[PDB]
């Protein structure tokens, strides 16, 4: 559910 932050300006919901 939460937002995953994988890099500068790069994120996604699982």
């Amino acid at each position: 559910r939460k937002r995953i932050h994988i890099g500068p300006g790069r994120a996604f919901y699982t």
Partner: antibody, heavy 123, light 108 residues
């Protein structure tokens, strides 16, 4: 097997700059971001910033924004951290670490870590 | 942004040790846990609140609810002594921080 090899120990005089390197192999360098972490002797971990190995965008923690430049060279598969205008109080161990997170990764977090680079600052 | 941790937790061998991590935006962001033993790089032990990487023993588990995440070491052993740090992003998501850190002591 993911491998991150950092450059060796440094000593600098106050006001100098130092550029530490972190050579990555065993994975696609442009797919993942690279974290940089500082640990002063006997203290906790401090996150400094990170960079996308692909598009090169960076973000920096409040403490180090304006004092450091993180960069990457995809053709050398290496990430870099430059620390400008060192003072003696900057003496610390520095780590790079690969972010394992990705749209197509089942994991996230700093799974793989370099061995650390000691930087000593003194006159 | 601070992730607040207790400076010290003690546990008797075979008992369950719990290390908490409090932060204002943990309701929206994932927590990660790192173990650092004497003279070594940190090791990722729990990710995305409650998932365990391969090769990490099953006695490590995590959970998170509201503004507190918790790392649980069931049946703690001497080899589990070390410094434990949680990690998460601030509200923007552009920056991570490590928590204030917890030293785990195994009694007896």
């Amino acid at each position: 097997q993911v491998q991150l090899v950092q450059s060796g120990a440094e000593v600098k005089k106050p006001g100098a700059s130092v550029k530490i390197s972190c050579k990555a192999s065993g994975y696609n360098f442009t797919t993942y971001a690279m974290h940089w972490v500082r640990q002063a002797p006997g203290q906790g971990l401090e996150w400094m910033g990170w960079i996308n190995g692909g598009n090169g965008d960076t973000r920096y923690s409040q403490k180090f924004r304006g004092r450091v430049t993180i960069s990457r060279d995809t053709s050398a598969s290496t990430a870099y951290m430059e620390l400008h205008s060192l003072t003696s109080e900057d003496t610390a161990l520095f780590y790079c670490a690969r972010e394992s997170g990705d749209y197509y990764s089942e994991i996230s977090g700093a799974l793989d870590w370099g061995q650390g680079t000691l930087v000593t600052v003194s006159s | 942004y601070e992730l607040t941790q207790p400076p010290s937790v003690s546990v008797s061998p075979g008992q369950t040790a719990r290390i908490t991590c409090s932060g204002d935006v943990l309701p929206k962001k994932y927590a990660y846990w790192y173990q650092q033993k004497s003279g070594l790089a940190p090791v990722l032990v729990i990710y995305e609140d409650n998932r365990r990487p391969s090769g990490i023993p099953e006695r490590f588990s995590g959970s998170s609810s509201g503004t507190m995440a918790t790392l649980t070491i069931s049946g703690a052993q001497v080899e589990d002594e070390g410094d434990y740090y949680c990690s998460s992003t601030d509200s923007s998501g552009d920056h991570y921080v490590f928590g204030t850190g917890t030293k785990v002591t195994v009694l007896g």
